[model samples]
Target: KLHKEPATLIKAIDGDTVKLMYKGQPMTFRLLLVDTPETKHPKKGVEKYGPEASAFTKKMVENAKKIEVEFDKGQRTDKYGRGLAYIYADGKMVNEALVRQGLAKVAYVYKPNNVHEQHLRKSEAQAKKEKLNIWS
Candidate 1:
């Protein structure tokens, strides 16, 4: 079964990951169909503006009073076992916002879901064109 409830964004772990409170549980989520430069990777050094990405994400989502999460097919677990979801706030998809701002890179999309993949593609393209995070 699928449930849509209001959530509170606690923090952004990176450009493409965030922590939120859902149903009274603190959950870390990796944005579906996107990956950002390693801000917290152990081996690789932080990418350019990695901190900026985290900050940008925090600005966008932190304290958002009402967040909507849509679960995809298969289990709630992603390949890495993290919860997979499409997140929204104030009727705007948070993932798309990150890509639109050039804070994240679109992953190779394989599965389809209720999320707007086309919008995400367009946002990523725009981000690449603007060289938001890619410039440095």
Candidate 2:
């Protein structure tokens, strides 16, 4: 069975990520099955809608008093030294929340960790049909 744990709240870095303090170090937590526009770029600069996604996450993370993070990855993190987990917020999976709210798109469909992939896809479709924020 997957181990789920409550983590201390942290600041949202973007629509799909947050920086959590872990073991006295900073651990980036990337939202599973979601991707948002990039807020910055080395050469091309910020992408369109990136800032808005960032703002959405900032408020969303701020309002979440606690994070009950559920682990799905075997290594407990992604390649960039970031933790990969499924977290629910605002009465829905945060990954799905971002998609349903139209702040992000379903992405990174690597296997084994795609336990919620189908749900994300459905959420994206619904969000698009309803013309949510990002879809609008």
Candidate 3:
């Protein structure tokens, strides 16, 4: 396996996005297979639980000593220009962590890129079963 590209957390842009530097180039990465609610929308304003999800992401990423971005085996960037990635904190999957905790929902499916979909869906189901946070 290729070594993960490690980076410092500039900040969590929202629940599912973050800013980090890679090879000294600053870039934004949207979580590869999930879409967090909008924390900052032009007309919609702050979406329900959006701030909580952002906070949850910060907790997940910031608690890790090193933040690394992992690319999908297939496509690695979105049309919006954000790098597509599954973020790792310490050594855990931050994207799945959010869903497992009911802090975010699974969205967007780009075929081959969604290798973790079943695992994430399982986590989401667990969150709902437990009535955690957003699912509660």
Compare the candidates by lDDT and give the number of the best one: 3
Better of 1 and 2 by lDDT: 2
lDDT of 1 by residue, 1-136 (tens): 6556677777778877788888898888877777667688668869876777777667777656678777766457667756778777766777888778877777887665435678788888887878876543
Comparing 2 with 3 on lDDT, the higher-scoring candidate is 3
- TM-score, cand. 1: 0.81
- Which prediction has more favorable TM-score, 1 or 2? 2
Residue by residue across 50-105, what tens digits does model 2's lDDT show?
Answer: 89888877776678766667777555687888899887554446777778888898
For residue 21, give model 3's deviation from the true position in Å: 0.6
Clash pairs for candidate 3:
none
Candidate with best TM-score: 3
- lDDT (Cα, 0-100) at 4 in candidate 3: 82
Model 1 accuracy (lDDT, Cα): 0.74
Q: How many Å off is the CA of 105 in candidate 3? A: 0.9
Query: What ranking emerges by TM-score with the best candidate at the front?
Result: 3, 2, 1
**Pairs with backbone N, CA or C atoms under 3 Å apart (clashes), candidate 1:** none
List the lowest-lDDT window of 10 residues for candidate 2. Answer: 87-96
